[PDB]
């Protein structure tokens, strides 16, 4: 599913990401934009052999099981395919664990390089929230 910007903001807010670990909703919308272009089906294979899945590009080395990332973990206790659903519930629950892991949203390389230090409130402007 390719979300609209405000449609995703609304879904993230309902699932409790607005100010989760102190990160306002615009941070999460910006992250999704530059990770996946708001596409739940986005996948990308990494040089280490791991794959990033779904609207927040959650990685198979630590967070999900895809059966093809040797020596990896599954700390969200989910098949990586769950992160590609039109239903963002699994992606959100896993993202809450990731952002609590120690480095905050710096875990998302596109957030650190393209959202951090920018006017992230702009990503929720005009939305009915």
PDB file of C-alpha atoms in Angstrom:
ATOM      1  CA  UNK A   1       0.000   0.000   0.000  1.00  0.00           C
ATOM      2  CA  UNK A   2       1.323   3.503  -0.832  1.00  0.00           C
ATOM      3  CA  UNK A   3       0.070   5.831   1.953  1.00  0.00           C
ATOM      4  CA  UNK A   4      -0.803   9.462   1.514  1.00  0.00           C
ATOM      5  CA  UNK A   5       1.280  11.730   3.775  1.00  0.00           C
ATOM      6  CA  UNK A   6      -1.642  12.722   6.073  1.00  0.00           C
ATOM      7  CA  UNK A   7      -3.153   9.208   5.916  1.00  0.00           C
ATOM      8  CA  UNK A   8       0.158   7.831   7.304  1.00  0.00           C
ATOM      9  CA  UNK A   9       0.480  10.602   9.929  1.00  0.00           C
ATOM     10  CA  UNK A  10      -3.020   9.673  11.160  1.00  0.00           C
ATOM     11  CA  UNK A  11      -2.225   5.938  11.232  1.00  0.00           C
ATOM     12  CA  UNK A  12       1.134   6.552  13.093  1.00  0.00           C
ATOM     13  CA  UNK A  13      -0.687   8.822  15.636  1.00  0.00           C
ATOM     14  CA  UNK A  14      -3.399   6.257  16.273  1.00  0.00           C
ATOM     15  CA  UNK A  15      -0.659   3.595  16.865  1.00  0.00           C
ATOM     16  CA  UNK A  16       1.058   5.811  19.511  1.00  0.00           C
ATOM     17  CA  UNK A  17       4.170   7.155  17.673  1.00  0.00           C
ATOM     18  CA  UNK A  18       3.497  10.927  18.288  1.00  0.00           C
ATOM     19  CA  UNK A  19       6.128  11.838  20.951  1.00  0.00           C
ATOM     20  CA  UNK A  20       7.140   8.168  21.383  1.00  0.00           C
ATOM     21  CA  UNK A  21      10.582   8.362  23.105  1.00  0.00           C
ATOM     22  CA  UNK A  22      10.194  12.130  22.632  1.00  0.00           C
ATOM     23  CA  UNK A  23       9.999  12.069  18.745  1.00  0.00           C
ATOM     24  CA  UNK A  24       7.150  14.184  17.449  1.00  0.00           C
ATOM     25  CA  UNK A  25       4.959  12.703  14.675  1.00  0.00           C
ATOM     26  CA  UNK A  26       6.649  14.709  11.910  1.00  0.00           C
ATOM     27  CA  UNK A  27       9.937  12.846  12.651  1.00  0.00           C
ATOM     28  CA  UNK A  28       8.207   9.518  11.953  1.00  0.00           C
ATOM     29  CA  UNK A  29       6.469  10.778   8.791  1.00  0.00           C
ATOM     30  CA  UNK A  30       9.716  12.282   7.436  1.00  0.00           C
ATOM     31  CA  UNK A  31      11.547   9.017   8.225  1.00  0.00           C
ATOM     32  CA  UNK A  32       8.903   6.985   6.328  1.00  0.00           C
ATOM     33  CA  UNK A  33       9.049   9.361   3.368  1.00  0.00           C
ATOM     34  CA  UNK A  34      12.815   9.005   2.846  1.00  0.00           C
ATOM     35  CA  UNK A  35      13.019   5.305   3.885  1.00  0.00           C
ATOM     36  CA  UNK A  36      10.139   3.904   1.763  1.00  0.00           C
ATOM     37  CA  UNK A  37       8.375   6.782  -0.072  1.00  0.00           C
ATOM     38  CA  UNK A  38       5.356   5.759   2.098  1.00  0.00           C
ATOM     39  CA  UNK A  39       5.238   2.321   0.406  1.00  0.00           C
ATOM     40  CA  UNK A  40       4.590  -0.568   2.809  1.00  0.00           C
ATOM     41  CA  UNK A  41       5.945  -3.061   0.213  1.00  0.00           C
ATOM     42  CA  UNK A  42       9.383  -1.415  -0.090  1.00  0.00           C
ATOM     43  CA  UNK A  43      12.329  -3.820   0.256  1.00  0.00           C
ATOM     44  CA  UNK A  44      16.024  -3.199  -0.218  1.00  0.00           C
ATOM     45  CA  UNK A  45      18.920  -5.635   0.075  1.00  0.00           C
ATOM     46  CA  UNK A  46      22.013  -4.360   1.979  1.00  0.00           C
ATOM     47  CA  UNK A  47      25.684  -5.029   1.197  1.00  0.00           C
ATOM     48  CA  UNK A  48      25.930  -7.219   4.377  1.00  0.00           C
ATOM     49  CA  UNK A  49      23.179  -9.557   2.896  1.00  0.00           C
ATOM     50  CA  UNK A  50      20.459  -8.253   5.255  1.00  0.00           C
ATOM     51  CA  UNK A  51      17.266  -6.705   3.833  1.00  0.00           C
ATOM     52  CA  UNK A  52      15.244  -3.629   4.925  1.00  0.00           C
ATOM     53  CA  UNK A  53      11.456  -4.101   4.931  1.00  0.00           C
ATOM     54  CA  UNK A  54       8.361  -1.904   4.862  1.00  0.00           C
ATOM     55  CA  UNK A  55       7.392   1.695   5.468  1.00  0.00           C
ATOM     56  CA  UNK A  56      10.279   2.236   7.991  1.00  0.00           C
ATOM     57  CA  UNK A  57      12.842  -0.066   6.280  1.00  0.00           C
ATOM     58  CA  UNK A  58      13.353  -2.329   9.334  1.00  0.00           C
ATOM     59  CA  UNK A  59      16.425  -4.542   8.962  1.00  0.00           C
ATOM     60  CA  UNK A  60      16.664  -8.380   9.129  1.00  0.00           C
ATOM     61  CA  UNK A  61      20.064  -8.524  10.916  1.00  0.00           C
ATOM     62  CA  UNK A  62      18.520  -7.661  14.260  1.00  0.00           C
ATOM     63  CA  UNK A  63      14.774  -7.105  14.092  1.00  0.00           C
ATOM     64  CA  UNK A  64      12.882  -9.639  11.930  1.00  0.00           C
ATOM     65  CA  UNK A  65      13.260 -13.104  10.432  1.00  0.00           C
ATOM     66  CA  UNK A  66      13.582 -13.501   6.652  1.00  0.00           C
ATOM     67  CA  UNK A  67      15.358 -16.945   6.658  1.00  0.00           C
ATOM     68  CA  UNK A  68      18.236 -15.584   4.546  1.00  0.00           C
ATOM     69  CA  UNK A  69      20.335 -13.386   6.893  1.00  0.00           C
ATOM     70  CA  UNK A  70      22.942 -15.677   8.522  1.00  0.00           C
ATOM     71  CA  UNK A  71      23.772 -15.187  12.146  1.00  0.00           C
ATOM     72  CA  UNK A  72      20.926 -12.624  12.465  1.00  0.00           C
ATOM     73  CA  UNK A  73      18.422 -12.099  15.273  1.00  0.00           C
ATOM     74  CA  UNK A  74      14.626 -11.507  15.307  1.00  0.00           C
ATOM     75  CA  UNK A  75      14.195  -9.166  18.278  1.00  0.00           C
ATOM     76  CA  UNK A  76      10.660  -8.074  17.134  1.00  0.00           C
ATOM     77  CA  UNK A  77       9.636 -11.775  16.918  1.00  0.00           C
ATOM     78  CA  UNK A  78       8.067 -11.424  13.462  1.00  0.00           C
ATOM     79  CA  UNK A  79       8.611 -12.633   9.931  1.00  0.00           C
ATOM     80  CA  UNK A  80       9.982  -9.698   7.901  1.00  0.00           C
ATOM     81  CA  UNK A  81       6.991 -10.163   5.520  1.00  0.00           C
ATOM     82  CA  UNK A  82       4.729  -8.822   8.334  1.00  0.00           C
ATOM     83  CA  UNK A  83       6.441  -5.445   7.866  1.00  0.00           C
ATOM     84  CA  UNK A  84       5.106  -5.210   4.250  1.00  0.00           C
ATOM     85  CA  UNK A  85       1.389  -5.358   5.244  1.00  0.00           C
ATOM     86  CA  UNK A  86      -1.095  -2.574   4.382  1.00  0.00           C
ATOM     87  CA  UNK A  87      -1.663  -2.693   8.199  1.00  0.00           C
ATOM     88  CA  UNK A  88       1.312  -0.816   9.767  1.00  0.00           C
ATOM     89  CA  UNK A  89       0.759  -2.342  13.232  1.00  0.00           C
ATOM     90  CA  UNK A  90       3.794  -4.694  13.066  1.00  0.00           C
ATOM     91  CA  UNK A  91       6.065  -1.958  11.659  1.00  0.00           C
ATOM     92  CA  UNK A  92       5.003   0.430  14.457  1.00  0.00           C
ATOM     93  CA  UNK A  93       5.475  -2.132  17.281  1.00  0.00           C
ATOM     94  CA  UNK A  94       8.923  -2.989  15.969  1.00  0.00           C
ATOM     95  CA  UNK A  95       9.857   0.685  15.465  1.00  0.00           C
ATOM     96  CA  UNK A  96       9.004   1.328  19.155  1.00  0.00           C
ATOM     97  CA  UNK A  97      11.507  -1.380  20.180  1.00  0.00           C
ATOM     98  CA  UNK A  98      14.189  -0.009  17.766  1.00  0.00           C
ATOM     99  CA  UNK A  99      13.853   3.623  18.887  1.00  0.00           C
ATOM    100  CA  UNK A 100      14.152   2.415  22.558  1.00  0.00           C
ATOM    101  CA  UNK A 101      17.437   0.474  21.795  1.00  0.00           C
ATOM    102  CA  UNK A 102      19.863   3.370  22.734  1.00  0.00           C
ATOM    103  CA  UNK A 103      20.484   5.564  19.619  1.00  0.00           C
ATOM    104  CA  UNK A 104      16.939   6.850  19.251  1.00  0.00           C
ATOM    105  CA  UNK A 105      15.908   7.611  15.671  1.00  0.00           C
ATOM    106  CA  UNK A 106      19.595   7.686  14.606  1.00  0.00           C
ATOM    107  CA  UNK A 107      18.884   3.937  13.947  1.00  0.00           C
ATOM    108  CA  UNK A 108      17.173   5.214  10.713  1.00  0.00           C
ATOM    109  CA  UNK A 109      19.922   6.448   8.411  1.00  0.00           C
ATOM    110  CA  UNK A 110      17.490   8.414   6.253  1.00  0.00           C
ATOM    111  CA  UNK A 111      16.147  10.159   9.413  1.00  0.00           C
ATOM    112  CA  UNK A 112      19.643  11.175  10.575  1.00  0.00           C
ATOM    113  CA  UNK A 113      20.693  12.357   7.055  1.00  0.00           C
ATOM    114  CA  UNK A 114      17.486  13.939   5.812  1.00  0.00           C
ATOM    115  CA  UNK A 115      15.104  14.735   8.725  1.00  0.00           C
ATOM    116  CA  UNK A 116      17.219  15.405  11.879  1.00  0.00           C
ATOM    117  CA  UNK A 117      17.655  19.169  12.400  1.00  0.00           C
ATOM    118  CA  UNK A 118      15.022  20.047   9.709  1.00  0.00           C
ATOM    119  CA  UNK A 119      11.515  21.500  10.146  1.00  0.00           C
ATOM    120  CA  UNK A 120       9.905  18.047  10.584  1.00  0.00           C
ATOM    121  CA  UNK A 121       6.555  19.655  11.684  1.00  0.00           C
ATOM    122  CA  UNK A 122       6.169  20.496   7.958  1.00  0.00           C
ATOM    123  CA  UNK A 123       5.432  16.750   7.311  1.00  0.00           C
ATOM    124  CA  UNK A 124       2.132  16.943   9.351  1.00  0.00           C
ATOM    125  CA  UNK A 125       1.106  20.447   8.218  1.00  0.00           C
ATOM    126  CA  UNK A 126      -2.344  20.557   6.636  1.00  0.00           C
ATOM    127  CA  UNK A 127      -3.323  17.151   8.091  1.00  0.00           C
ATOM    128  CA  UNK A 128      -6.464  16.479  10.056  1.00  0.00           C
ATOM    129  CA  UNK A 129      -4.909  14.926  13.233  1.00  0.00           C
TER     130      UNK A 129
END
